[PDB]
Structures are given as structure tokens and as C-alpha cells.
């Protein structure tokens, strides 16, 4: 029982996840750090 209604706010948006880059604080560095 799936509706075909819809919403202005369920349009696609921010469809890519940012990942924490090499210098910002990647889980590798924090794995290292003291």
C-alpha cells in the first residue's frame, strides 16, 4: 500500500555524502594520533 502522493520537500537534494578528507580529520589520522 504505497501512495503516489509526494512532497515539495522530498525532491532529491544533497544527493552526495561528503567524506572527511585527508587533512580535515580522517579516521586514519585519528586512529594514529596521540
Amino acid at each position: 500500500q504505497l501512495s503516489k502522493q509526494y512532497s515539495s520537500r522530498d525532491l532529491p537534494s544533497h544527493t552526495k555524502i561528503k567524506y572527511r578528507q585527508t587533512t580535515q580529520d580522517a579516521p586514519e589520522e585519528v586512529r594514529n594520533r596521540d
Binding site: 501512495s3 503516489k4 502522493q5 509526494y6 515539495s8
Partner: protein
């Protein structure tokens, strides 16, 4: 036919949409019907867009029947596109239209005040309808996904029913 099928499916027999897409009641309606029979901006935006196209295709039918002329058709089309504000009444339902409306005024002041640079006069016969046509085509490029969403929602709600459970 689509808009009439909508009107009559909701069981609103006291209203009727006439052939230039005017919506008119055929009674005087009590409160319950003045309320039950209010419509939204989807219905009315679709109504008014269809009214613009009927104006256009009927100018062309007048041309093809022999009633007017090539020049009268061209200038009447230019007229139509310059004066969408006073012929449709679209701005009531999506007021952002005035972008377009102001644009088709600016163009007309250009073209006119370059059309009649010499002995040519301030009279009607100026149909160079490329510019306003372009403008309303870009407007339609923008509006079709919006209206397809709004009408999809209206039709769904009319055929499934409105969901008052987990709002």
C-alpha cells in the same frame, strides 16, 4: 474535457466551466457548497494556461477560416503575447509571473519604438511576435515540472484519498 471530468467527479454539479475556461456557478451556493467547491492553485493554473493556448489556437483558426488576414493574425498574436496580464488573469495563482509580464513590456517598448521610427505610426499593425513568444515558452519550460507535481498530488488525493493517519 479533463477539467470538466474533474469538476463532475468531485460531485460538484452546481459549477460548470464554459468554453473559454471560465468557471461559473449555475446556482447561488450555500456555505457548504461555497466551501466544498473551492479549488486550488493547481486547478486554476491549469485552467489559465489552457486559456492562453485556446486564445492562440483560436486566433489561428480565424486565420484559416478566412475571417481575418495574414497581417491581422500576426498582429493579433503579438497582441496576445504582450497582454497576457489583461487576457488570462494568470498572475492571481502564481504571482511570480510578473517577471515574465514585465519582460514582455520591456521588449514591446524596444520593438515599438524601433518599429515606428519613421512615417510608421502609433497604430495597431505591429506583429513581430518572436520575442514575447520566446518569453512564454521559457516560462512553460519552468512551470511544467511544477504543475506535473501539483497535478499528480491532486489526482492521487482524489483517487486514493487523503492520508489523515500519520501526518
Amino acid at each position: 474535457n479533463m477539467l470538466n471530468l474533474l469538476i463532475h467527479r468531485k460531485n460538484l454539479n452546481y459549477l460548470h466551466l464554459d468554453y473559454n475556461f471560465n468557471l461559473k456557478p449555475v446556482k447561488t451556493l450555500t456555505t457548504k457548497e461555497r466551501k466544498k467547491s473551492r479549488f486550488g492553485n493547481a486547478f486554476h493554473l491549469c485552467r489559465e494556461v489552457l486559456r492562453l493556448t485556446k486564445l492562440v489556437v483560436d486566433s489561428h483558426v480565424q486565420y484559416r477560416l478566412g475571417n481575418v488576414d495574414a497581417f491581422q493574425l500576426a498582429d493579433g498574436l503579438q497582441y496576445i503575447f504582450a497582454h497576457v496580464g489583461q487576457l488570462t488573469g494568470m498572475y492571481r495563482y502564481k504571482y511570480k509571473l510578473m517577471r515574465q509580464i514585465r519582460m514582455c513590456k520591456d521588449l514591446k517598448h524596444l520593438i515599438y519604438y524601433r518599429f515606428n521610427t519613421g512615417p510608421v505610426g502609433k497604430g495597431p499593425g505591429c506583429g513581430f511576435w518572436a520575442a514575447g513568444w520566446r518569453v512564454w515558452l521559457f516560462f512553460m519550460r519552468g512551470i511544467t515540472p511544477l504543475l506535473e507535481r501539483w497535478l499528480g498530488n491532486l489526482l492521487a488525493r482524489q483517487f486514493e484519498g487523503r492520508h489523515s493517519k500519520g501526518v
